Amino acid sequence: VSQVRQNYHSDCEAAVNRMLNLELYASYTYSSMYAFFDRDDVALHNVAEFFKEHSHEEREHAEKFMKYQNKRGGRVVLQDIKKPERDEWGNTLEAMQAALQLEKTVNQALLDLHKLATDKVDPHLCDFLESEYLEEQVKDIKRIGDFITNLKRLGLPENGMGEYLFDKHSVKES
Amino acid sequence: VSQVRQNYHSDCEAAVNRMLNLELYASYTYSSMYAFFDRDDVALHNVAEFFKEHSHEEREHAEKFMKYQNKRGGRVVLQDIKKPERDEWGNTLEAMQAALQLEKTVNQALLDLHKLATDKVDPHLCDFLESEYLEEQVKDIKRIGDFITNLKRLGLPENGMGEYLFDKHSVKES
Amino acid sequence: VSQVRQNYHSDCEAAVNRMLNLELYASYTYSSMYAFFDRDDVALHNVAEFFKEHSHEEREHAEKFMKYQNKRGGRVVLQDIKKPERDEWGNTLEAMQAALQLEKTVNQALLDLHKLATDKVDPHLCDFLESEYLEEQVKDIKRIGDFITNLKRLGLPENGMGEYLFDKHSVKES
Amino acid sequence: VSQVRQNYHSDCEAAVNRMLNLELYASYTYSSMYAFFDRDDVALHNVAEFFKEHSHEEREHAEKFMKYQNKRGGRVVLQDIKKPERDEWGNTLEAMQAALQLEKTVNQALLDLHKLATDKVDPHLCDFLESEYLEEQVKDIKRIGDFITNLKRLGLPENGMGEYLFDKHSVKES
Ligand SMILES: [Cl-]
Ligand SMILES: [Cl-]
Ligand SMILES: [Cl-]
Ligand SMILES: [Cl-]
Ligand SMILES: [Cl-]
Ligand SMILES: [Cl-]
Ligand SMILES: [Cl-]
Ligand SMILES: [Cl-]
Ligand SMILES: [Cl-]
Ligand SMILES: [Cl-]
Ligand SMILES: [Cl-]
Ligand SMILES: [Cl-]
Ligand SMILES: [Cl-]
Ligand SMILES: [Cl-]
Ligand SMILES: [Cl-]
Ligand SMILES: [Cl-]
Ligand SMILES: [Cl-]
Ligand SMILES: [Cl-]
Ligand SMILES: [Cl-]
Ligand SMILES: [Cl-]
Ligand SMILES: [Cl-]
Ligand SMILES: [Cl-]
Ligand SMILES: [Cl-]
Ligand SMILES: [Cl-]
Ligand SMILES: [Cl-]
Ligand SMILES: [Cl-]
Ligand SMILES: [Cl-]
Ligand SMILES: [Cl-]
Ligand SMILES: [Cl-]
Ligand SMILES: [Cl-]
Ligand SMILES: [Cl-]
Ligand SMILES: [Cl-]
Ligand SMILES: [Cl-]
Ligand SMILES: [Cl-]
Ligand SMILES: [Cl-]
Ligand SMILES: [Cl-]
Ligand SMILES: [Cl-]
Ligand SMILES: [Cl-]
Ligand SMILES: [Cl-]
Ligand SMILES: [Cl-]
Ligand SMILES: [Cl-]
Ligand SMILES: [Cl-]
Ligand SMILES: [Cl-]
Ligand SMILES: [Cl-]
Ligand SMILES: [Fe+2]
Ligand SMILES: [Fe+2]
Ligand SMILES: [Fe+2]
Ligand SMILES: [Fe+2]
Ligand SMILES: [Mg+2]
Ligand SMILES: [Mg+2]
Ligand SMILES: [Mg+2]
Ligand SMILES: [Mg+2]
Ligand SMILES: [Mg+2]
Ligand SMILES: [Mg+2]
Ligand SMILES: [Mg+2]
Ligand SMILES: [Mg+2]
Ligand SMILES: [Mg+2]
Ligand SMILES: [Mg+2]
Ligand SMILES: [Mg+2]
Ligand SMILES: [Mg+2]
Ligand SMILES: [Mg+2]
Ligand SMILES: [Mg+2]
Ligand SMILES: [Mg+2]
Ligand SMILES: [Mg+2]
Ligand SMILES: [Mg+2]
Ligand SMILES: [Mg+2]
Ligand SMILES: [Mg+2]
Ligand SMILES: [Mg+2]
Ligand SMILES: [Mg+2]
Ligand SMILES: [Mg+2]
Ligand SMILES: [Mg+2]
Ligand SMILES: [Mg+2]
Ligand SMILES: [Mg+2]
Ligand SMILES: [Mg+2]
Ligand SMILES: [Mg+2]
Ligand SMILES: [Mg+2]
Ligand SMILES: [Mg+2]
Ligand SMILES: [Mg+2]
Ligand SMILES: [Mg+2]
Ligand SMILES: [Mg+2]
Ligand SMILES: [Mg+2]
Ligand SMILES: [Mg+2]
Ligand SMILES: [Mg+2]
Ligand SMILES: [Mg+2]
Ligand SMILES: [Mg+2]
Ligand SMILES: [Mg+2]
Ligand SMILES: [Mg+2]
Ligand SMILES: [Mg+2]
Ligand SMILES: [Mg+2]
Ligand SMILES: [Mg+2]
Ligand SMILES: [Mg+2]
Ligand SMILES: [Mg+2]
Ligand SMILES: [Mg+2]
Ligand SMILES: [Mg+2]
Numbered sequence: 129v130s131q132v133r134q135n136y137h138s139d140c141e142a143a144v145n146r147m148l149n150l151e152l153y154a155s156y157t158y159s160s161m162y163a164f165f166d167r168d169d170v171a172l173h174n175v176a177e178f179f180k181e182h183s184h185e186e187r188e189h190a191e192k193f194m195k196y197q198n199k200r201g202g203r204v205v206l207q208d209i210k211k212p213e214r215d216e217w218g219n220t221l222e223a224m225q226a227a228l229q230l231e232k233t234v235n236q237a238l239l240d241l242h243k244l245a246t247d248k249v250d251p252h253l254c255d256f257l258e259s260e261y262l263e264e265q266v267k268d269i270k271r272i273g274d275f276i277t278n279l280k281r282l283g284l285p286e287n288g289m290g291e292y293l294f295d296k297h298s299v300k301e302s
Numbered sequence: 303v304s305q306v307r308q309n310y311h312s313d314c315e316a317a318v319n320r321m322l323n324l325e326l327y328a329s330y331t332y333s334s335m336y337a338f339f340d341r342d343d344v345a346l347h348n349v350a351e352f353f354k355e356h357s358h359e360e361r362e363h364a365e366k367f368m369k370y371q372n373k374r375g376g377r378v379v380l381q382d383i384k385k386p387e388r389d390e391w392g393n394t395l396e397a398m399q400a401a402l403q404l405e406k407t408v409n410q411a412l413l414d415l416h417k418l419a420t421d422k423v424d425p426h427l428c429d430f431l432e433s434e435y436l437e438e439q440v441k442d443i444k445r446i447g448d449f450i451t452n453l454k455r456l457g458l459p460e461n462g463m464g465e466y467l468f469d470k471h472s473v474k475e476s
Numbered sequence: 477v478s479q480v481r482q483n484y485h486s487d488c489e490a491a492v493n494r495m496l497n498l499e500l501y502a503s504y505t506y507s508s509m510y511a512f513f514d515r516d517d518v519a520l521h522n523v524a525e526f527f528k529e530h531s532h533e534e535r536e537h538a539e540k541f542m543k544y545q546n547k548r549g550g551r552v553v554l555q556d557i558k559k560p561e562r563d564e565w566g567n568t569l570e571a572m573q574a575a576l577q578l579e580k581t582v583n584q585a586l587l588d589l590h591k592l593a594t595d596k597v598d599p600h601l602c603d604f605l606e607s608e609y610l611e612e613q614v615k616d617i618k619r620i621g622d623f624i625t626n627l628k629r630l631g632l633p634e635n636g637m638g639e640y641l642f643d644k645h646s647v648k649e650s
Numbered sequence: 651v652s653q654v655r656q657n658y659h660s661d662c663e664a665a666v667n668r669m670l671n672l673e674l675y676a677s678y679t680y681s682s683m684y685a686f687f688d689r690d691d692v693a694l695h696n697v698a699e700f701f702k703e704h705s706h707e708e709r710e711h712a713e714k715f716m717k718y719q720n721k722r723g724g725r726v727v728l729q730d731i732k733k734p735e736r737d738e739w740g741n742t743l744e745a746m747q748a749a750l751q752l753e754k755t756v757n758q759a760l761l762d763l764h765k766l767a768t769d770k771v772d773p774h775l776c777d778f779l780e781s782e783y784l785e786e787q788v789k790d791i792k793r794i795g796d797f798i799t800n801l802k803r804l805g806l807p808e809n810g811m812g813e814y815l816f817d818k819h820s821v822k823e824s
Contacts, residue, residue, distance in 0.1 A: 132447040132516045134406055135413055156557070163542045163552040168480045171796035180539075187535070191528075194511045199444045204511040209504070209557035251416050252440055255432040288803035289812050296819045448519035455636035464637050471644045480795040482754055483761055547792045599764050600788055603780040 130201030137248040141202035143241050144193055144253075149207050150237050151190035154230055157212040158183035161227070164217045172295040175220050177302030182227070182268075189261070196256060220291050221276065221284035228272045235265045304375030311422040315376035317415050318367055318427075323381050324411050325364035328404055331386040332357035335401070338391045346469040349394050351476030356401070356442075363435070370430060394465050395450065395458035402446045409439045478549030485596040489550035491589050492541055492601075497555050498585050499538035502578055505560040506531035509575070512565045520643040523568050525650030530575070530616075537609070544604060568639050569624065569632035576620045583613045652723030659770040663724035665763050666715055666775075671729050672759050673712035676752055679734040680705035683749070686739045694817040697742050699824030704749070704790075711783070718778060742813050743798065743806035750794045757787045 158179045165176035197204050217223040238261050245253035278298060282290030332353045339350035371378050391397040412435050419427035452472060456464030506527045513524035545552050565571040586609050593601035626646060630638030680701045687698035719726050739745040760783050767775035800820060804812030 130447075130516055131402065131450065132443050134409055134443070152557075156554070159539075159542070160552070160554055163546065166543065166546045167551070168478055168546065168549060168792060168795040169799055171799040173796075191507075194507070195514065198511065198514045198516065199440050201447075201516060203515070204508070205563060206504070206508055206559045208559050209500075211554045211556050215553060249417065251413070251420075251428070251432055252436045255436060289805060289809065289815070292800060292803055292812075292815070292819075444516060447516040448521075451517055451519040452640060455640055457637060461637065464640075467637070467640070471640075478795075479750065479798065480791050482757055482791070547788050549795075597765065599761070599768075599776070599780055600784045603784060 130203075132199075133201030135250060135252070136200045136202060137250065140241075140245055140248055140250055140253055141197065141200070143244055144197050144202060145205045145207075147237055147241055148190050148193040148197070148204070149209065150234060151186050151193060152209045153212075154234055155183045155186035155190065156209055157230055158186060158227075160212040160214070161217055161223050164223070165220075172220060172291070174295045174299040174302050175223070178299040179223070179227075192260060200252070219285050220294060221279040224272055224276050224279060228269065228276060231265065231269050231272060235262075235269065238262060238265060304377075306373075307375030309424060309426070310374045310376060311424065314415075314419055314422055314424055314427055315371065315374070317418055318371050318376060319379045319381075321411055321415055322364050322367040322371070322378070323383065324408060325360050325367060326383045327386075328408055329357045329360035329364065330383055331404055332360060332401075334386040334388070335391055335397050338397070339394075346394060346465070348469045348473040348476050349397070352473040353397070353401075366434060374426070393459050394468060395453040398446055398450050398453060402443065402450060405439065405443050405446060409436075409443065412436060412439060478551075480547075481549030483598060483600070484548045484550060485598065488589075488593055488596055488598055488601055489545065489548070491592055492545050492550060493553045493555075495585055495589055496538050496541040496545070496552070497557065498582060499534050499541060500557045501560075502582055503531045503534035503538065504557055505578055506534060506575075508560040508562070509565055509571050512571070513568075520568060520639070522643045522647040522650050523571070526647040527571070527575075540608060548600070567633050568642060569627040572620055572624050572627060576617065576624060579613065579617050579620060583610075583617065586610060586613060652725075654721075655723030657772060657774070658722045658724060659772065662763075662767055662770055662772055662775055663719065663722070665766055666719050666724060667727045667729075669759055669763055670712050670715040670719070670726070671731065672756060673708050673715060674731045675734075676756055677705045677708035677712065678731055679752055680708060680749075682734040682736070683739055683745050686745070687742075694742060694813070696817045696821040696824050697745070700821040701745070701749075714782060722774070741807050742816060743801040746794055746798050746801060750791065750798060753787065753791050753794060757784075757791065760784060760787060 161179035162176050162183060164170055165172045165179065194204050214226070217226065238257055242254055242257050242262070245257065275294075275298060279290075279294060282294055284291055284294075335353035336350050336357060338344055339346045339353065368378050388400070391400065412431055416428055416431050416436070419431065449468075449472060453464075453468060456468055458465055458468075509527035510524050510531060512518055513520045513527065542552050562574070565574065586605055590602055590605050590610070593605065623642075623646060627638075627642060630642055632639055632642075683701035684698050684705060686692055687694045687701065716726050736748070739748065760779055764776055764779050764784070767779065797816075797820060801812075801816060804816055806813055806816075
């Protein structure tokens with residue numbers, strides 16, 4: 129037993145490792161979206177940079193789980209990072225829809241981890257999830273939903289001018 | 303009944319007073335460690351200053367419970383602060399081992415208080431513990447465990463050179 | 477055919493995707509080393525930070541291949557990022573030995589890619605490898621070899637004091 | 651024989667003069683595009699300025715070949731700069747398509763010169779081409795391809811609003 133370990137259930141330790149993997153998976157998916165929007169036959173560079181930024185954020189969230197694991201006396205166990213579901217992402221609307229689904233998948237896993245931590249009476253883990261993950265998750269879901277609404281308003285997928293304008297006005301110029 | 307009191311159970315009020323006492327006890331133990339490492343026949347002054355700092359931190363945490371008690375309309379009730387378990391602390395490894403145990407004792411009392419606050423459906427007290435005590439506790443336990451690992455690596459208790467080097471490189475120069 | 481594509485062989489495009497994967501694999505291995513040295517029963521934090529930095533560097537090198545692929549009109553194709561070979565890394569000497577091997581594996585793949593680019597008469601790709609990858613690779617191999625020499629000099633694996641001192645003097649304080 | 655000349659083949663000297671001429675030709679073509687977009691019945695001034703900038707860049711690249719020739723002990727030999735292929739350039743999409751073709755023609759000539767320098771075992775000339783010409787060429791081809799993709803997305807040639815918006819958002823305001 130680790131000398132630091134206190135009130136940290138084996139099930140929570142394992143679930144933290146699984147959540148770490150999911151954050152890495154999410155990061156990799158966003159990296160794929162970045163590369164897609166940087167293609168010469170896609171060429172929406174502010175959209176590309178948006179997804180690149182989100183890839184980096186998810187990788188930071190994975191690292192934060194590694195640090196958490198060690199702080200509690202658990203042991204990091206890594207698994208393969210599966211490649212993303214798609215090799216090409218269609219257009220800005222399709223990609224944003226996939227991102228919304230991904231963020232809700234990650235949110236569900238965080239909420240499930242919170243249920244487990246609650247079950248095992250681990251208030252430190254509950255607080256960590258609430259303070260470092262749950263609020264920023266709701267904000268990302270809201271932002272992406274807002275974007276989807278605007279992409280539909282702009283006539284995606286058919287309205288190429290609308291898609292061009294979204295890249296200029298909705299996502300930060302990069 | 304205090305005019306400010308709302309949703310604050312007598313049992314929680316009493317447990318806050320007990321936790322206050324434990325913080326004061328922890329502070330006093332760290333003060334003893336400070337004085338020990340400042341002895342001319344011990345003379346590890348950065349180690350001494352580390353424990354002096356932790357003594358001050360625990361006293362601040364006691365004061366924060368006093369303020370909390372009054373904010374909720376409870377009444378501070380003080381008891382004797384018992385002297386520390388030992389009069390002399392052996393060496394840096396022995397002291398760090400005792401500090402680890404002390405921090406885990408304090409953590410257990412905080413977790414028990416959180417269980418009580420949860421039982422009595424006091425989300426303010428739960429949040430206070432989570433936001434002001436539980437995370438910094440995990441960090442202190444991790445730091446001290448890391449130190450113990452390094453002290454063993456350095457050949458404590460027998461390796462006096464190792465102990466000298468720990469005082470120069472592991473704890474902040476004071 | 478991509479409208480930008482010129483003098484870019486399908487074989488080179490595929491090899492760039494494979495090299496991208498290898499950079500991601502290397503990044504992941506370094507992340508594992510970071511997490512290991514951050515364990516409370518390992519606790520060599522400057523060593524941990526060294527490997528964290530190298531993980532970030534390799535991820536940047538992967539991103540640079542993505543950008544390269546798109547600049548030439550190739551298409552990024554991602555595969556699973558395999559988990560690292562080990563779950564625990566022994567000690568600083570064992571980890572550094574594994575890092576040396578990893579950097580030489582990456583170097584060999586870069587040199588093989590250069591051979592292919594030379595075969596296909598692609599001077600842009602040759603220059604990219606020479607200017608962005610090959611020199612920094614030689615420097616990393618030299619640095620890690622120098623470290624291994626010093627770890628052996630310090631009496632690793634048996635000399636715990638030597639290992640402690642390496643973490644204080646050889647790797648940047650983090 | 652020039653007193654400075656060493657390892658510089660007559661064929662390479664001649665090919666450098668031909669490449670100089672091609673850079674001047676490219677500059678002149680871009681100047682024609684500038685003047686076209688500045689016409690009162692065309693009036694896309696940011697597009698005009700984009701082409702003016704590229705004209706200046708190509709003239710700088712011609713000058714760099716003159717300097718190179720003299721450094722190696724070759725002799726600059728100038729020929730007529732042929733007028734551009736067209737007197738009018740249609741619209742932003744047509745012009746960008748012609749620019750893409752021009753940049754790929756220049757790239758092919760650079761790659762052919764590199765083949766010759768390789769044949770004649772002239773590493774100085776190979777390095778000069780790789781370090782001063784080949785990478786910036788790939789970048790220009792990628793940028794122009796990205797633009798063409800966006801012009802098609804914006805509904806060129808028929809969508810005049812799309813063309814107006816490209817001039818405001820895609821090319822630097824001048
Ligand atoms: Cl436990
Ligand atoms: Cl408990
Ligand atoms: Cl357990
Ligand atoms: Cl696991
Ligand atoms: Cl997993
Ligand atoms: Cl599987
Ligand atoms: Cl796909
Ligand atoms: Cl979807
Ligand atoms: Cl999903
Ligand atoms: Cl949050
Ligand atoms: Cl929007
Ligand atoms: Cl009450
Ligand atoms: Cl209530
Ligand atoms: Cl009550
Ligand atoms: Cl009481
Ligand atoms: Cl008490
Ligand atoms: Cl008593
Ligand atoms: Cl005693
Ligand atoms: Cl003890
Ligand atoms: Cl204790
Ligand atoms: Cl806290
Ligand atoms: Cl230490
Ligand atoms: Cl090709
Ligand atoms: Cl060619
Ligand atoms: Cl091919
Ligand atoms: Cl491939
Ligand atoms: Cl692969
Ligand atoms: Cl496999
Ligand atoms: Cl292992
Ligand atoms: Cl190895
Ligand atoms: Cl390897
Ligand atoms: Cl390099
Ligand atoms: Cl060294
Ligand atoms: Cl010569
Ligand atoms: Cl020679
Ligand atoms: Cl000759
Ligand atoms: Cl000539
Ligand atoms: Cl000519
Ligand atoms: Cl002629
Ligand atoms: Cl014409
Ligand atoms: Cl054309
Ligand atoms: Cl042409
Ligand atoms: Cl260049
Ligand atoms: Cl654009
Ligand atoms: Fe995340
Ligand atoms: Fe405390
Ligand atoms: Fe690399
Ligand atoms: Fe040029
Ligand atoms: Mg142990
Ligand atoms: Mg377990
Ligand atoms: Mg999973
Ligand atoms: Mg698979
Ligand atoms: Mg599809
Ligand atoms: Mg509950
Ligand atoms: Mg709660
Ligand atoms: Mg909270
Ligand atoms: Mg919050
Ligand atoms: Mg966020
Ligand atoms: Mg998110
Ligand atoms: Mg998130
Ligand atoms: Mg908003
Ligand atoms: Mg009253
Ligand atoms: Mg009472
Ligand atoms: Mg007590
Ligand atoms: Mg007594
Ligand atoms: Mg004793
Ligand atoms: Mg907190
Ligand atoms: Mg603390
Ligand atoms: Mg503490
Ligand atoms: Mg504490
Ligand atoms: Mg630390
Ligand atoms: Mg096409
Ligand atoms: Mg192919
Ligand atoms: Mg591979
Ligand atoms: Mg496997
Ligand atoms: Mg092993
Ligand atoms: Mg270099
Ligand atoms: Mg490097
Ligand atoms: Mg390297
Ligand atoms: Mg490298
Ligand atoms: Mg060096
Ligand atoms: Mg002469
Ligand atoms: Mg001649
Ligand atoms: Mg010519
Ligand atoms: Mg003529
Ligand atoms: Mg015409
Ligand atoms: Mg050769
Ligand atoms: Mg070469
Ligand atoms: Mg070079
Ligand atoms: Mg270069
Ligand atoms: Mg250029
Ligand atoms: Mg050019
Ligand atoms: Mg050029
Ligand atoms: Mg660009």
